[PDB]
């Protein structure tokens, strides 16, 4: 399973 994020990715 891919790791969970630390924090949300930014929008594009």
């Amino acid at each position, epitope marked *: *399973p*891919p*790791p*969970n*994020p*630390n*924090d*949300p*990715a*930014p929008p*594009n």
Partner: antibody, heavy 111, light 113 residues
């Protein structure tokens, strides 16, 4: 998986330094790539991130215009450049993304 | 900035003892996607940090189930059911919901023997 940082640096006051963070074992473009300062004996301070999927950066206001963050998706390598170095910039610098941290790059500012 | 307050500053524990570390944020860590971005790290001297927990309670691969993370809003806890010798080091929480990202001051776990 892992993050491999470049080696230690001796740099003069007022010069700049560029360090690297090579990623493997997770999708480099799917997670924010963070840079974090630790003065030894002290805690962790966030510098900024780049999201390699689209190049967007976000910075701690303390480091805006001092730190430049880039990411080479062809080589899965992130870079941090710090300009106008002073004594307060001697520290270990980490990169961190997803479940991983790099091993740190020690920068010593000295003439 | 959102301040992360960690207590205690130091945990002095024997092998087998339960341990608990508190992390309180000055503002709610609930993000607009419904997730709470609270991470726990462990750092050993001359070594880098290692992530143990993300999204408040989700253990990373390979982390022993003696570790549990709990909380919501502003109040978070990392617990160790029974301390082992390899658990020593400095634990940090850090929040991913607000800018700038911020870290707790660390809790040093030391072993008595």
């Amino acid at each position: 998986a892992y993050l491999q940082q470049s080696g230690a640096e001796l740099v003069r006051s007022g010069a700049s330094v560029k360090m690297s963070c090579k990623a493997s074992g997770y999708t480099f473009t799917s997670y924010n790539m963070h840079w974090v300062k630790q003065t030894p004996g002290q805690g962790l301070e966030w510098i900024g991130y780049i999201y390699p999927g689209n190049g967007v950066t976000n910075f701690n206001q303390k480091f805006k215009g001092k730190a430049t963050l880039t990411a080479d998706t062809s080589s899965s390598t992130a870079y941090m450049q710090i300009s106008s170095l002073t004594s307060e910039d001697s520290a270990v610098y980490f990169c961190a993304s997803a479940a991983y941290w790099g091993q740190g790059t020690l920068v010593t500012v000295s003439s | 900035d959102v301040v992360m307050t960690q207590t205690p500053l130091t945990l002095s524990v024997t092998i087998g003892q339960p341990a608990s570390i508190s992390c309180k944020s000055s503002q709610s860590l609930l993000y607009s996607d419904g997730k709470t971005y609270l991470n726990w790290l462990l750092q050993r001297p001359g070594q880098s940090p290692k992530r143990l927990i993300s999204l408040v309670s989700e253990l990373d691969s390979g982390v022993p189930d003696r570790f549990t993370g709990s909380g919501s809003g502003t109040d978070f806890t990392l617990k160790i059911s029974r301390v082992e010798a390899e658990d020593l080091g400095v634990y940090y929480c850090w929040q991913g919901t607000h800018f700038p990202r911020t870290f707790g001051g660390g809790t040093k776990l030391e072993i008595k023997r």
